[PDB]
Amino acid sequence: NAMKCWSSSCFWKKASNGLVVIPYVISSEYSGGEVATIEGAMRAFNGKTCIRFVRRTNEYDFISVVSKTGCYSELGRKGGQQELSINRGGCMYSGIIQHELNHALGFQHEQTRSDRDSYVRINWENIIPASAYNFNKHDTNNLNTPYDYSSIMHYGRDAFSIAYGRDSITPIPNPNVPIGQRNGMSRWDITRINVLYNCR
Ligand SMILES: [Zn+2]
DSSP states (O other): OBOOOSSSTTSOOOOTTSOEEEEEEEOTTSOHHHHHHHHHHHHTTTTTSSEEEEEOSSOSSEEEEEOOSSEEEOSSOOSSEEEEEEOTTTOOSHHHHHHHHHHHHTBOOGGGSTTGGGTEEEOGGGBOGGGGGGGOOOOOBOTTOOOOTTOTTSOOTTTTBSSTTOOSEEESSOTTSOOOOOSSOOHHHHHHHHHHTTOO
């Protein structure tokens, strides 16, 4: 589910000591408690990856965390100031923040993987038309990892559903497999970070 870019000007820089140090600033709009929630979510990367989110000093490439419309991030390192939105009303949860930070690392939604049609059916007629593009298949760098229903990057079955009970995504051949967890990073989520950023 990683974006395909050969240059890695596209990705965060790895230091000679192996750490991928990603500078950030958090909008003054957030209270101290909200800052702590964001930084808490960032710590989830420390135990099992070489990713380190650190407060910016004066680095050129950095993440600016802002409370805008919904929860979103740019994909990968964009160069200079790049925004990541954690709306104060709907996004201040560890798993959601981790999901967004994974976008910033270069990871896309699980259901858009190039191999997705072997694991899910997209029920187009059930999807809010303006939001259907979120379900488009992409030419992803899958990093020799398999499709993971339990990925923090997988949409829930009712994501952008027009009406209750008519799901946007149905897992196949077993429709009962859970999708859409936002508790924490899956084994494959962690493995993918480590493969992409060559963490040792
Ligand atoms: Zn997302």
